[PDB]
């Protein structure tokens, strides 16, 4: 909540979202002003709500990992690769049936490391999607994910 102009009333908020400080992945104590640390001026943030997670390897998860009861919402998936990094692999997935396709990164697992053999810069392959919990909000956007972050 928040107290109003007079000292007799409290207005109610809707929900919360955490913002990382005291870390070495963003810059908040050098972009924000001094008045905003006391928190008395509404500023814009980018709320994130759910992250796309994948498990492409189906045979190593159906008879030994279907006790998770979380992967009840697998729909489809297409995937590619455009840039190689130290430990993760690029992917581009379509959302439901051909409405929106965007990017993600995935840590390749030992049951999925047999699905990639060195991906060409544009070669195609299937995918498997899921949307998992997330509750955060940054200043501008992360420099690694151009996902749908709602401006609030």
Automatic annotation (TrEMBL):
This chain belongs to the protein called CRISPR-associated RAMP family protein
Question: What is the source species?
Answer: Desulfonema ishimotonii
